[PDB]
RNA sequence: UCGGAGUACAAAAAACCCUCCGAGUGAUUUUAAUCUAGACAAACCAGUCAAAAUAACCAUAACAUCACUUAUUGAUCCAAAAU
């Protein structure tokens, strides 16, 4: 027969990002008496120090994704006073370019509830939402 | 028929339905807005 | 029960066993939990789903109910659209 | 599907292209049936299913309408991946 | 502090009737409650009176 | 009976004598600060990371590439400052501050983002995303010189390619253009790789494009060892990985093992392993560019299959493991009545012998 | 005479699984009356701070950091009031996923 | 009859006409569904949890909450309602 035509049917996809991309991957569903809820698979991090601004996506493992800090010279040069609301949203503009580059479409954001009302974080949700990244991470296929 | 009559008037029931309970939530709120302008103007009173 | 009846010499059967049991052909007998029509409105949604659910026995009470009725109720019956006749059987059982 | 002159040409093409996911490199539509332990109802679980294309290729009121639980996810990704491809450089 | 229980019956026409507990001292009661046979919040009224 | 502890203990180091006079934080946000500080050292009992696999905690990571750039570490510092201090001068970047009214050059700052620190993330990137445990699987290296892949999909329309992104197979059918700063004194080799996607081996990989003996920039001078071959991932599996990578080269590397022929279109012949290329030509090539994206199945795969590989389509998919249950009881107690279809092989009633 | 009522059958509140053990979803990992053990990952928390296992695999216990919700507020006051050095430590219950979530097979060439 | 603490110091269970607290429910609205894996406990009867899937609300929760929350409860049969 064709020498081609051999598949080997166990096929094995090495790739870690298979099945999160595939929405059928293994959420960590737990803790629930502990916060944040670690259900996701990416999740959004803002440390709002008292000279800096940074933003990272980490993986559910606590590695780091992508970031984007005011601490980076590239902002530095370009922003002024890296800690005011003009910061917050250039850093979330500046993590949103990089997470569509990266090819994160989908994250989670667990702010505490004065952290949400601050006038600040709600300009970065919003630069993430008009450059396209959005939060409300898919829920998993047979959870 | 029987069935044809239990659909009827589930369908007239239903068709109401947002009217009853729009005005059930207007019953609501000028009870309590009322109970409210009571307890105020009570208030208001003792305390002159 | 009468082991031996005074009339026919025949052994016979407890009627409150048949009225509130069910017995399938593979062995089991089914019930229902009781007090599933008890103050409903006095129970959790869980507890009143647990209560409606239908029951299985254990061995003991499944002999003691085989000792109770005759062989009457322990035939094969065909009945015509049985809701239990898919149950009547037992399959995979490896013991 | 070529060959199935008992149906009408745009009824053929509408086969082609909805159900080409189905259709063999040969051109042959195939149609999978597994549910019962009979082959007669199983032969007649592939003709429903048969009839079924056909009356949905014939009928031109189709809408295709589309359902909403998994397209957002492809929706969201398609507008974030042309939000890459909106570069305007000529190339080739 | 009597309370007492009350039988409403669904306004969607289908006849769905459940049972709650309430103060003696209240009005007739007049709640929102989910109609099985219609799978939407319906308003549900009090009907009769059984228990004390 | 009691046990020594094997080591300090976390809050033994604060006296609880005179709690008064000790400082004590008031904000929930500095405590979680502090104790997601604490929760990633190495503590001598059991932790969720060592149960969850932190990948055997620190590892030494083999680097294969470009040292880093020499710059004056004062002579950068003195001029970042001179440019802060010259923005800071200025009072209408004040007043569109304060008036949180302020646009930012993104085109600019991720210029100098991959500039300066674009390298070490898409290093990052490409450990979360496995490149390097698939490649070489000891070793690492990271991206010191950008480089630019783009696929045309019209006349006006540039479909670019960078780390981790996610790229049709019709958009990918025509071979991409790449760009790289170089200076002309250099060789350069370029590999398009698919790592998943291979039917028979696991860890085996396809070439996709293989140019070698790069002058510089102008790749298309340059000749080709492998011809270019579209993405052709599996309907079922999806979202497989396609890796461009760069190596720098001092000599003109000639080979006639790894020369494909002019149609390649056998699956035996594009057989790769990325490990045992760089083990051959360890010696010249050094990686210097890295360039990823993810490419799920499409309507061009089928024809790609059908047309140039000539063979059929194979359709995979998802399948979970069969749902557990116990061992089936002779009398089942308290059990639902449901509990004799949880063994059922068919929903078919079986006469046996009427 | 004068104590009435102190007879009650104890409630089995206690441990089911212990570390190494094998579960499968839906089991019992262990029940208790107040916050003795807690979540982790795969456990879930029941009405009657039950805690079971979500997925199939292996029981662990370990010792981590305490970061309570923000909107409760006697944990928020207790972390609040805690001196600057001071982490909190509880014993989480894990549950360690053994089987793959899936397997690519193949099915038909078309 | 039911629950909590000690007896019963560390998995579970464990008695006395042993030592002390309690319960035979209130207040409020978020009026809290169906179906089903797998489990706890248990002589039996009873009691408890619960993933996935379904229809309505944010298109991001629904376990009703509080009073030490744990106890606030009664089997068949038989009688009544409107089934
Ligand atoms: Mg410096
Ligand atoms: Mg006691
Ligand atoms: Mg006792
Ligand atoms: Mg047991
Ligand atoms: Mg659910």
């Known amino acids: 027969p064709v020498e081609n035509e051999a598949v080997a049917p166990e096929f094995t996809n090495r790739n870690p990002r298979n099945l999160e991309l595939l929405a059928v991957a293994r959420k960590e569903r737990g803790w629930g008496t502990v916060w944040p809820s670690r259900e996701f698979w990416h999740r959004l991090r803002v440390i709002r120090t008292q000279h800096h601004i940074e933003a990272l996506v980490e993986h559910r493992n606590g590695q780091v994704v992508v970031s984007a800090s005011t601490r980076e010279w590239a902002i530095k040069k370009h922003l002024y006073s890296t800690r005011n609301v003009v910061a917050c949203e250039s850093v979330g503009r500046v993590l949103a370019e990089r997470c569509l580059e990266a090819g994160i479409n989908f994250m989670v954001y667990h ?18 939402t008009e450059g396209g990244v959005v939060l409300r991470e898919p829920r998993r296929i047979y959870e | 028929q029987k069935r044809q009559a239990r659909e009827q008037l589930i369908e007239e029931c239903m068709a109401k339905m947002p009217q009853m309970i729009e005005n059930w939530r207007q019953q609501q709120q000028e009870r309590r807005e009322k109970e409210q302008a009571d307890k105020d103007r009570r208030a208001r009173l003792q305390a002159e | 029960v009468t082991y031996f009846s005074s009339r026919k010499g025949k052994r016979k059967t407890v009627k409150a066993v048949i009225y ?51 062989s009457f109720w322990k035939r094969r019956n065909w009945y015509a659209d049985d809701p239990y006749q898919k149950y009547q059987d037992r399959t995979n059982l490896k013991v | 599907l070529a060959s199935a002159d008992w149906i009408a040409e745009p009824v053929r093409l509408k086969l082609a292209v909805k159900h080409k996911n189905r259709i063999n490199r040969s051109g042959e539509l195939i149609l999978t049936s597994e549910c019962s332990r009979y082959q007669f109802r199983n032969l007649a679980d592939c003709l429903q299913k048969l009839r079924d294309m056909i009356a949905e290729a014939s009928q031109p009121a189709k809408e295709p309408s589309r359902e909403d639980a998994e397209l957002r996810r492809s929706r969201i990704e398609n507008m974030n991946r042309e939000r890459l491809r909106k570069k305007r450089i000529s190339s080739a | 502090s009597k309370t007492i229980l009350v039988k409403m019956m669904s306004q969607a026409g289908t006849g769905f009737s459940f049972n709650t507990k309430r103060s003696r001292l209240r009005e007739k009661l007049t709640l929102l409650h989910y109609d099985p046979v219609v799978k939407k919040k319906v308003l549900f009224v009090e009907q009769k009176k059984i228990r004390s | 009976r009691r046990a020594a502890p094997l080591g300090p203990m976390p809050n033994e180091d604060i006296d609880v004598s005179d709690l008064e006079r000790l400082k004590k934080y008031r904000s929930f946000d500095r405590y979680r600060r502090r104790a997601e500080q604490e929760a990633r050292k190495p503590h001598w009992w059991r932790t969720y990371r060592e149960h969850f696999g932190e990948e055997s905690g620190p590892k030494d990571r083999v680097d294969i590439g470009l040292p880093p750039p020499k710059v004056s570490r004062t002579q950068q510092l003195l001029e970042r400052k001179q440019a802060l201090r010259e923005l800071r001068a200025n009072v209408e970047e004040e007043r569109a501050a304060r008036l949180q009214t302020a646009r930012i050059p993104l085109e600019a700052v991720r210029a100098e983002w991959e500039r300066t620190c674009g390298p070490y993330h898409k290093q990052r990137l490409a450990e979360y995303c496995g490149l390097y445990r698939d490649l070489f699987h000891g070793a690492t290296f990271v991206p010191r010189v950008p480089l630019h892949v783009a696929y045309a999909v019209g006349e006006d329309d540039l479909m670019p390619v960078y780390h981790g992104n996610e790229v049709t197979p019709t958009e990918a059918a025509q071979a991409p253009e790449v760009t790289y700063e170089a200076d002309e004194g250099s060789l350069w080799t370029l590999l398009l790789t698919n790592l998943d996607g291979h039917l028979l081996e ?108 000539d063979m059929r389509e194979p359709v995979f998919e998802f399948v979970r493991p069969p749902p557990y249950h116990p061992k089936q009881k002779r009398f089942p107690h308290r059990q639902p009545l449901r509990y004799l279809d949880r063994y059922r092989d068919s929903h078919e009633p079986t006469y046996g012998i009427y | 005479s004068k104590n009435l009522g102190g007879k009650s059958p104890g409630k089995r509140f206690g441990i089911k699984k212990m570390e190494g053990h094998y579960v499968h979803a839906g089991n019992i990992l262990a029940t208790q009356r107040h916050f003795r053990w807690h979540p982790g990952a795969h456990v879930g928390l029941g009405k009657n701070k039950c805690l079971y296992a979500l997925e199939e695999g292996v029981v662990r216990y370990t010792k981590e950091v305490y970061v309570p919700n923000p909107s409760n507020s006697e944990a928020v006051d207790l972390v609040t009031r805690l001196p600057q050095g001071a982490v909190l430590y509880k014993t989480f219950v894990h549950v360690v996923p053994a089987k793959p979530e899936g397997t690519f097979k193949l099915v038909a060439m078309l």
Not at chain 3, 32 to 48: C, E, F, N, Q
Not at chain 6, 216 to 243: D, M
Request: charged letters at 25%; proline letters at 6%.
């Open chain 1, 111 to 128: 702010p505490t509830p004065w952290e949400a009302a601050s006038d600040s974080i709600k300009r970065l949700q919003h630069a993430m």
């Open chain 6, 202 to 309: 696991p860890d085996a990989e396809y070439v996709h494009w293989l140019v070698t003996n790069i002058p510089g920039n102008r790749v298309t001078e340059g000749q080709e060892t492998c011809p270019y071959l579209p993405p052709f991932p599996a309907r079922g599996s999806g979202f497989h990985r396609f890796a461009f990578l760069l190596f720098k080269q001092d000599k003109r590397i000639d080979f006639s093992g790894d020369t494909r022929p002019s149609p390649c279109y056998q699956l035996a012949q594009r057989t790769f392993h990325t490990f045992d290329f760089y083990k051959k030509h360890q010696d010249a090539m050094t990686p210097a560019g890295l360039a990823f994206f993810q490419c799920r199945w499409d309507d061009s795969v089928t024809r790609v299959f059908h047309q140039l590989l």
């Open chain 3, 20 to 70: 509130r049991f069910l017995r399938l052909h593979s062995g089991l007998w089914l019930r229902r939990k009781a007090g599933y029509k008890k103050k409903l409105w006095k129970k959790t949604a869980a507890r009143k789903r647990r209560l409606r659910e239908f029951v299985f026995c254990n061995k003991t009470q499944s002999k003691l109910l085989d000792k109770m009725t005759t």
